């Protein structure tokens, strides 16, 4: 079984969506009428920008400590989503983060893919520093935040309270996280404020047979879902 | 002009076609010294949070013979105001024909509390220069009026009035 998914002009291949997690069991959804207002006015461009965007692949090695991305930050140079994210002032969007990872049967290791709401990292006081964009940042084992603390002084073993998946190479080699819009507000600035944060840390480290490929690829494919923004909506009276 | 009768009149005249706006009004009804002391702004100063729409209404007070066009542009929040007529036209705008309608109304929707420059802009540009028939004066005045809509909402009273 091999499921080929098309969004817009963009096509990806998934071995199977057999174990695809939905954070808090809540699927992405537009701003409902009970929480909307015809005078605080949204529009829905979930036509074109809401497609699969595939970041530049990262290379998992024996020495890799982890990687992280912020959202909608990572997609701030990604075509129409990045355009809308700057043209519009207020926006909301869920995501579908499909972390594929390509390894042989003679590689071994495990990744913990964690989706974090309000992933405030720390050695933080800098926008460019806290928002690396498309390439994301990396963790450490001692700026760059600490592996076992997630940066936020926080034992990684408890990280599984967050929405997550485990990519254990002997079993599954891909993970999917369906993230709804999570914020204290129904809608907010995308450029000033990242709602979600992806963090991929090797729980079990990479290892492999003698002369296998030394560094395997982890690929992220992020699809905005139910992307909606403001709000140019003017009434001209006679 | 301030604290006079002339502080209420935007004068249109005949001068080189600089696409600088006739006016560019920022939509901070609580903190903008123009909109601040309007009745709307006076009430908003009594409250901490507020949200709704503002209808602005420009009224032409020239001759019945005068003819021309103005461009009333609306820049949403987060967008810096347009500096030229083309930038204004490619955005949200109303071409107001003076000879046909003496007023132009524009309802701006995304007005909310400052804190505790954003909100947007209402700009006015010359699309055309004003055409008069004879020795009719080539110096007119447009007035402007602002109000909240029925939807508009305030809350958490903050009377701050001392000496």
């Amino acid at each position: 079984r091999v499921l080929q998914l098309t969004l817009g002009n963009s096509t990806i291949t998934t071995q199977e969506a057999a174990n695809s997690v939905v954070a808090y069991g809540r699927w992405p959804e537009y701003l409902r009428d009970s929480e909307a207002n015809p005078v605080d006015q949204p529009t829905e461009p979930d036509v074109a920008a809401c497609r699969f965007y595939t970041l530049d692949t990262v290379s998992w090695t024996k020495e890799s400590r982890g990687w992280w991305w912020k959202l909608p930050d990572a997609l701030r140079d990604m075509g129409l989503f990045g355009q809308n994210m700057y043209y519009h002032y207020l926006g909301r969007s869920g995501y579908t983060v499909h972390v594929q990872c390509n390894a042989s049967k003679f590689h071994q290791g495990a990744l913990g893919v964690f989706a974090v709401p309000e992933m405030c990292l720390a050695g933080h006081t800098s926008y460019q520093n806290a928002n690396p964009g498309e390439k994301g940042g990396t963790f450490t084992g001692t700026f760059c935040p600490v592996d076992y603390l997630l940066g936020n002084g926080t034992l990684l073993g408890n990280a599984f309270v967050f929405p997550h998946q485990i990519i254990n190479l002997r079993t599954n080699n891909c993970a999917t996280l369906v993230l709804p819009y999570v914020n204290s507000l129904s809608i907010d600035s995308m450029v000033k404020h990242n709602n979600w944060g992806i963090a991929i840390l090797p729980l079990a480290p990479l290892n492999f047979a003698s002369e296998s490929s030394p560094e395997i690829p982890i690929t992220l494919t992020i699809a905005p879902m139910c992307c909606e923004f403001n709000g140019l909506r003017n009434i001209t009276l006679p | 002009k301030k604290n006079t009768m002339e502080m209420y009149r935007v004068r249109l005249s005949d001068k080189p076609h600089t696409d600088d706006p006739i006016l560019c009004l920022s939509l901070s009804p609580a903190s903008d010294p123009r909109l601040s002391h309007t009745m709307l702004g006076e009430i908003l100063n009594y409250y901490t949070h507020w949200a709704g729409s503002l209808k602005f209404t420009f009224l032409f007070c020239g001759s019945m013979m005068a003819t021309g066009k103005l461009l009333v542009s609306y820049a949403p929040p987060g967008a810096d105001p347009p500096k030229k007529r083309k930038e204004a036209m490619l955005g949200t705008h109303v071409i107001w024909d003076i000879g046909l309608q003496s007023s132009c109304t524009m309802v701006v929707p995304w007005i909310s509390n400052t804190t505790y420059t954003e909100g947007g802009y209402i700009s006015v540009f010359y699309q055309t220069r004003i055409v008069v028939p004879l020795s009719t004066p080539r110096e007119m005045d447009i007035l402007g009026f602002v109000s909240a809509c029925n939807d508009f909402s305030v809350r958490l009273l903050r009377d701050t009035t001392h000496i």
């Binding site: 129904s186 | 409250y47 909310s112 804190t115 909402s153």
Partner: peptide, 13 residues
């Protein structure tokens, strides 16, 4: 800060 607010005029009574 920029929050969606429903109609509420009770405190302006």
């Amino acid at each position: 800060r920029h929050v969606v607010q429903h109609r509420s005029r009770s405190e302006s009574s």
